[PDB]
Amino acid sequence: GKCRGLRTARKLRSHRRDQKWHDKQYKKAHLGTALKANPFGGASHAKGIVLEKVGVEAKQPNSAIRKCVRVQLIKNGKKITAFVPNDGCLNFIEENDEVLVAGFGRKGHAVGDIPGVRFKVVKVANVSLLALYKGKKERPR
Amino acid sequence: PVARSWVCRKTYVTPRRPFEKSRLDQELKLIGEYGLRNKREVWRVKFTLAKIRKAARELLTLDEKDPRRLFEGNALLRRLVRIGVLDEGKMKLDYILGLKIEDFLERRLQTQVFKLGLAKSIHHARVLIRQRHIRVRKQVVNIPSFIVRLDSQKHIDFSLRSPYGGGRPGRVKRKNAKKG
Amino acid sequence: DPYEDFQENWNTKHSSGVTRELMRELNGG
Amino acid sequence: EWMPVTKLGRLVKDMKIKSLEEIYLFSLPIKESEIIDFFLGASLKDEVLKIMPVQKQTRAGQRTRFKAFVAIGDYNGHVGLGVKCSKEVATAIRGAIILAKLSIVPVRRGYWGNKIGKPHTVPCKVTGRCGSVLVRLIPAPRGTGIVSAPVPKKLLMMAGIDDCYTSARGCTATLGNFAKATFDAISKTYSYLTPDLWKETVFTKSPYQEFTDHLVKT
Amino acid sequence: RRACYGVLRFIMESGAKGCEVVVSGKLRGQRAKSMKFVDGLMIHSGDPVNYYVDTA
Amino acid sequence: GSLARAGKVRGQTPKVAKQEKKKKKTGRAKRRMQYNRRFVNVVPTFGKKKGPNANS
RNA sequence: CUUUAAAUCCUUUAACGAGGAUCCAUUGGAGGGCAAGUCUGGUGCCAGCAGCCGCGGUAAUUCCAGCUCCAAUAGCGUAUAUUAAAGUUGCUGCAGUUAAAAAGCUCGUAGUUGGAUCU
């Protein structure tokens, strides 16, 4: 049972803040060891420079080749594999290009089919991928 | 430092569940019945009702000889009689909880222009207000969600500069007179 | 017929669609 | 054509019982659905809540039946809830509408604050349980609507409750247990002793005793 | 389903002691199932199959 | 894997051009149009097919 | 004209100013969660979609498109922080036989909690 006195608030307030630490949603946002491990550092987006186009394989029950891009981030030098989303969207990218990268949507976890990929390309060469895919703009060289 | 006020306030709340049939259906019936433009004009009148229910529901926990309930509760019913939503014999604080959205939507200037017969449809009232043909006691009112008070219901008319009440014809009639 | 198409295809890929259509037929307006 | 097979059916069909509340007052079971069709009838309305395929393993595959959860009731009145399982979905729906007519209970409706007009809400806080689903109903002020999940909302609207606060603990995704727990909570409205039901009960004759001389003519 | 039910209710109203209607084929989809629309009594074995049950 | 097929189906698709139709409606008159479609002069007709954009 | 230091803007007024009133409304979607097409053409576990479940191996309700329909609407998608949903941190208000979990047992200081009784 729980303690239930009237002078027991120090037992109550301090049992909770030790028991709060077994909460993995609490710990991953308060310990600080998973924000120095995050490649962004707690930003929504980041920019980088494309090293190469590595295309990685889908997971078990369904087969395709997810076309990704190996990015090296500007602000801390870290490296990142980001997913180039729609079809024919690797054909707007060459090597050594500057790419704004987002998260995939699961807040630092992989999104189902793709293994170990937590980011997706947003803009290439300071123009948007939705502007290139839908033909609204032209790829600047 | 600036001499500006940053005090603003949102006037609507969006629902918790976005795709819910018979919420969609009921609000579409209230859009079509009263000539409104989008859902946000129903969510706005749902919000001023939810402020009035909530303030009366707070005042119902204080007892009948409270100071605050007797003052602020009589000033809540006074406004609801004044805009014509409540009647006069129903001024206990518990016929507030029997009010609905339609009581508040019947008091807009749009439906009152339709009710008095200055229009011939509920969408004909929206344009006749918005084209500046409608005045209230002296003043051209250009806003359809102008809640008509009870004393200003007897003075709603046709705006003495307009082709409908005043008489100087518009853009179209004069050009056809030029081509006569 | 939503009854038959549900009773046949409740097991297939089209199960969610035929359940949607069967509730549409049963509930109705 | 209806030919009643019970003493209660022979009494209802011959116009000898003038309401459903006599059959509720003497707590008698109802075995024929045409009694409910006789009394409520043209004001009753039903909704199928879920069609659920269930599968028995045999040595030649799987044998498939379909359960149907049917809610029913009269808005301002009464509510039922029936589950029938069969090989055809139309047969399951028809047997479930019979079973939902036979399990019709009356709901007691009270007031939240001041007692003006007609009742609108639950009289007190009642709870109802079915296998790790609790449902609690709480009385609500005049005009708040049913504040609840979509599945107990159909039953609470069919009962005639106009406004009610609700809370559900448990695995409420299993819809049969969530339907069968809010039905249990709105059954306990008429078995809760509030201090107006403290008056000593004045007894009257059972229908079987009052019409014991007409019931030997048949 | 509806078309076999109409025939079955006709040939049970007309006083037959029982019937059985089977429609086999690919009535929906590419794998082909069957149906079994049955009512009443139905004799399968023995010699009275020749004169009591009428098949087609 | 092999990156050579990228934009295969996007460039393989036969290019059909969009057909010119009228300007749709906007705003309050659009809401009036879809209220008139659904609520006033709803059709006394084959109910339970309440699936607008029903193909067949 | 008015406004203003002087201007602008809005308010007020001349004159011109709408029939595909081309003076065209967009952003996401149509398997289920979740409103709304097992329509037609293409591709054929490929390209790709998909938050999750799942979709695609030659009849794809899900990809690429055409039409049609839906939702919000001068706004609508995405990413990340955070709050509710979370009675999944629990004081209100959770759990601990078998699902994660009662210290091997006992003594013991601090802490916490302590039986009647007085006009």
* Domain ranges, ordered by start, for chain B: 18-180
Per the DSSP assignment, residues forming a β-bridge with A82 are: A69
- Provide the b/e sequence for A119-134 (b: ≥16 CB within 10 Å): bbbbbbbeeebeebbe
Q: Which nucleotide is nearest to B16 (CA to C1')?
A: G85
Find out whether D112 and D139 touch, Cβ atoms under 8 Å: yes
Q: Output the CA torsion E23→E26→E31→E36 (10° steps).
A: -20
As ranges, strand G nucleotides with an atom below 7 A of a protein CB are: 12-13, 16-18, 20-22, 24-25, 28, 30-39, 41-43, 45-57, 59, 61-74, 78-82, 87-92, 94, 96, 102, 111-114
Q: Which of residues 65-94 of B touch strand G (CB under 7 A)?
A: none
**CB within 8 Å of D7: residues ≥ 6 apart:** D208, D215
Q: Where are the beta strands (DSSP E) in E1-56?
A: 18-21, 37-40
Cα(first)–Cα(last) distance of chain A, in Å? Answer: 70
Least Cα distance to A80 among A40, A32, A35 occurs for A40
Chain F segment 13-32 residues within 8 A of B by beta carbon are: 27-29, 31-32
Q: Are strands A119-124 and D126-129 parallel, antiparallel or unpaired?
A: unpaired
Q: How far is B100 from chain D (nearest CA, A)?
A: 8
Number of CB pairs, chain B paired with chain D, less than 8 A apart: 17
Can you read off the two tokens belonging to residue A82? 């980001």
Bridge partners (DSSP) listed for residue E18: E40
State the Cα–Cα distance between residues D63 and D59, nearest whole angstrom. 10
Residues of D in contact with B53 (CB under 8 A): 141, 143-144
CA distance F3 to A68: 10
Name the residue closest to the C1' of G71 by its CA. Answer: B19
Quick check: D143 and B97 CB within 8 A?
yes
For residues A51 and A73, the answer to whether their CB atoms sit within 8 Å is no
Residue E27 to chain C, least CA–CA distance (Å)? 10
Domain that holds residue A102: 1-141
- The set of residues, in sequence order, having a beta carbon less than 8 Å from that of D209 and lying 6+ positions away, is none
1-56 of chain F touching strand G, CB 7 A cut-off: 1-2, 5-10, 12-24, 26-27, 30-31, 34, 37, 51-56
Q: How far is F33 from chain C (nearest CA, A)?
A: 20
The distance of D52 to chain C (nearest Cα, Å) reads: 10
Closest CA to E1 of E30, E51, E37: E37
Which chains are adjacent to chain B, needing at least 3 Cβ pairs under 8 Å?
D, F
Helices within chain D (DSSP H only): 7-13, 21-25, 33-39, 89-102, 150-159, 175-185, 207-210
Strand pairing report for A127-128 and B135-136: unpaired
Q: Is residue F15 within 8 angstroms of chain A, CB to CB?
A: no
| Cβ A46 vs Cβ A100: under 8 Å | yes
Task: Please give the C-alpha separations between residue E17 and each of D139, E4, E6, E48, E53, in angstroms, as whole numbers.
Answer: 58, 17, 17, 14, 10
**Single-letter code of the amino acid located at B117:** G
Burial track D169-187 (b if 16+ CB lie within 10 A, e otherwise): ebebeeebbbbbbbbbbbb
- Closest partner residue to B53 (CB to CB) among D114, D116, D143 is D143
- How far, rounded to the nearest angstrom, does the alpha carbon of residue A57 sit from its chain's CA centroid? 18
**Mutation target among C7, C8, C14, C21 for the D interface, most CBs of D within 10 A:** C7
Q: Tokens for E7?
A: 């025939």
Residue A57 to chain F, least CA–CA distance (Å): 7
Q: Are D146 and D174 in contact (CB under 8 A)?
A: no
With beta carbons less than 8 A apart as the criterion, state whether B60 and B73 touch: no
Yes or no: say if B136 and B147 are a contact pair by the CB < 8 Å rule: no
CB atoms within 10 A of CB B81: 14
* Closest among A119, A80, A79 to A102, alpha carbons compared: A119
Q: Which two tokens stand for residue A81?
A: 């594999």
- Residue A114 tokens, joined: 């793709």
Helix, strand, coil fractions of chain F, as percent rounded to 5: 30, 0, 70
Q: Collapsing DSSP states into helix, strand and coil, what is residue F48?
A: coil
Chain centre to alpha carbon of residue A24: 18
Residue nearest to nucleotide G100 (CA to C1'): A22
Q: How far is CA B138 from CA A138, B101, B113, B116, B143, in A?
A: 58, 29, 16, 17, 15
The number of C-alpha atoms within 13 Å of D184 and in the hemisphere containing its C-beta is 16
Q: How far apart are CA D137 and CA D146, in angstroms?
A: 10
**Upper half-sphere CA count for residue F40 (Cβ side, 13 Å):** 12
Which chain A residues 41-100 have CB under 7 A to strand G?
Answer: 42-45, 58, 62-67, 85-90
Query: Pick from A47, A28, A21: which is nearest to A107 by CA?
Result: A28
Residue that the structure tokens 């795709």 belong to: B19
User: Taking each helix axis from N to C terminus, what angle separates C2-9 and D89-102, rounded to the nearest 10 degrees?
Assistant: 110
> What resolution in Å is listed for this PDB structure?
3.2
Number of other residues whose CB lies within 10 A of the CB of residue D30: 19
Residue A102 Cα distances to A82, A84, D24, angstroms: 9, 11, 65
Nucleotide minimizing C1' to CA distance for residue F30:
G73
Contact D143 B94 (CB under 8 A): no
CA gap A53, B143 in Å, rounded = 58
User: Which element (helix H / strand E) includes D165?
Assistant: strand D164-170
Q: Do E28 and C3 touch (CB under 8 A)?
A: no
CA–centroid distance for A77 within its chain: 16
Taking the C-alpha atoms of residue D166 and residue D127, their distance in angstroms, rounded to an integer, is 10
Question: CATH for D7-106, among 3.40.50.2000, 3.40.1110.10, 3.30.160.20, 3.40.50.300?
Answer: 3.30.160.20
- Report chain E's terminal Cα–Cα distance, integer Å: 19
Nucleotide nearest to F56 (CA to C1'): G39
CB A43 within 8 A of CB A119: no
What SS3 class is residue F19? coil
**DSSP letter (8 states) at residue F20:** P
The CA distances from residue B79 to B44, B63, B83, F9, in Å, are 18, 22, 6, 65
What whole-number distance in Å separates Cα of residue F1 and Cα of residue F21?
Answer: 45
Residue E6 burial (C-beta neighbours within 10 Å; 0-12, 13-18, 19+)? exposed
State whether residue F50 sits within 8 Å of chain C by CB: yes
Interaxial angle between packed helices B67-82 and B40-59, expressed in degrees from 0 to 180 and rounded to the nearest 10: 150
Q: Chain F residue with minimal CA distance to B36?
A: F28
The rounded distance, in Å, linking the Cα atoms of B125 and D20 is 52
> Strand pairing of D133-139 and D146-147?
unpaired
Residue D159 contacts by C-beta under 8 Å, 6 or more apart in sequence? D73, D75, D77, D78, D79, D107, D186
Classify residue C19 as exposed, middle or buried by CB count within 10 Å of its CB (0-12, 13-18, 19+).
Answer: middle
- How many C-beta atoms lie closer than 10 Å to residue B6's C-beta? 5
Q: What domain count does chain A have?
A: 1
Output Rg (C-alpha) for chain C, integer angstroms.
Answer: 9
Interface contact flag, C8 E2, Cβ < 8 Å? no
Q: How far apart are CA B145 and CA B135, in angstroms?
A: 14
Please name the member of D113, D114, D143 whose beta carbon is closest to the beta carbon of B98.
Answer: D143
- C8–D contact, CB cutoff 8 A: no
C-alpha to C-alpha distance for D167 and D197, rounded to whole angstroms: 27
The residues facing D105 across adjacent strands are D79
What lies within 8 Å, CB to CB, of B126 at 6+ separation is B35, B110, B144, F28
- Contact check, Cβ <8 Å, F7/A57: no
Closest C-alpha to B49, from B76, B25, B23? B76
Give the closest nucleotide to A107 (alpha carbon vs C1'). Answer: G80
Which of B52, B32, B34, B146 has its CA nearest to residue B99?
Answer: B52
Q: How far is the CA of A31 from the C1' of G38 (A)?
A: 51
**Chain F residue with minimal CA distance to B41?**
F28
Nearest-Cα distance to chain F for B93, in Å, is 36
Six-digit token pair at B174? 């004069």
Report the relative pairing of strands D146-147 and D164-170 from DSSP bridges. Answer: parallel
Nucleotide with smallest C1' distance to residue B17 CA = G34
